Design a protein around this ligand. Structure first.
Ligand SMILES: *[C@@H]1O[C@H](CO)[C@@H](O)[C@H](O)[C@H]1NC(C)=O
Ligand SMILES: *[C@@H]1O[C@H](CO)[C@@H](O)[C@H](O)[C@H]1NC(C)=O
Ligand SMILES: *[C@@H]1O[C@H](CO)[C@@H](O)[C@H](O)[C@H]1NC(C)=O
Lengths: 49, 50, 98
């Protein structure tokens, strides 16, 4: 009978979490993925001029 | 005429001064009657109330 | 305020208590500093006279008694809660000056 599942492993990381006006998480930034998201995490801004 | 004040506007700002006022934006909540709000207001969720 | 049912405590940027849900009555009651304001006293100098006026910061001249301790403080302080010499400025409500 056709079914599938996925197994992944967690890791101690730093995340930047965005909350909307409704109180739900709509986007996240991995602070240790790439230098762009790392700069977004340190500057605490999802955008950057 | 661009730099002199005109009687058409309620304020005495000129055309150049009106453009300078509109080109300044605030990253914080502005100083406009902010204690008229934050009292008896349902939407008391902003930076200048807090 | 629109409250998610799977939440109990609402906070602000400063991590203080902003909105809470009463477990008995399901209504949203906002935790606020109880009608605060700023007081600055304007005087012409004690060498001339003892008459003074009080300036309230940014508040209206209508909710000034429910902001100040109108029901708690002494009548000497309560002559400045309301009176005939009430003027509304952009900086706030001024009491004492004509
Ligand atoms: C937020 O909640 C309101 C009220 O239920 C809803 O209309 C809206 O679609 C929700 N999402 C956004 C992004 O505003
Ligand atoms: C008891 O608590 C429930 C919970 O919401 C409330 O609906 C009810 O009115 C309370 N009864 C009394 C007598 O306080
Ligand atoms: C408070 O003062 C402002 C500014 O004059 C006015 O627009 C507003 O109607 C006043 N509110 C009350 C309740 O008096």
């Amino acid at each position: 009978g056709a079914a599938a599942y996925y197994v992944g492993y967690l890791q101690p990381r730093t995340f930047l979490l965005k909350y909307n006006e409704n109180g739900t998480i709509t986007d996240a930034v991995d602070c240790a993925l790439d230098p762009l998201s790392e700069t977004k995490c340190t500057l605490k801004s999802f955008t950057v001029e | 005429s661009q730099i002199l004040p005109d009687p058409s506007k309620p304020s005495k700002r000129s055309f150049i001064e009106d453009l300078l006022f509109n080109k300044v934006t605030l990253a914080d909540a502005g100083f406009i009657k902010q204690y008229g709000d934050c009292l008896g207001d349902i939407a008391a969720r902003d930076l200048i109330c807090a | 305020k629109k409250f998610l049912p799977f939440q109990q405590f609402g906070r602000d940027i400063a991590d203080t208590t902003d909105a809470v849900r009463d477990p008995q009555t399901l209504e949203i009651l906002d935790i606020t500093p109880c009608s605060f304001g700023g007081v600055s006293v304007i005087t012409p100098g004690t060498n001339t006279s003892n008459q003074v006026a009080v300036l309230y910061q940014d508040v209206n001249c209508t909710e000034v008694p429910v902001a100040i301790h109108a029901d708690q403080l002494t009548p000497t302080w309560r002559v400045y809660s309301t009176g005939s010499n009430v003027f509304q400025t952009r900086a706030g409500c001024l009491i004492g000056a004509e």
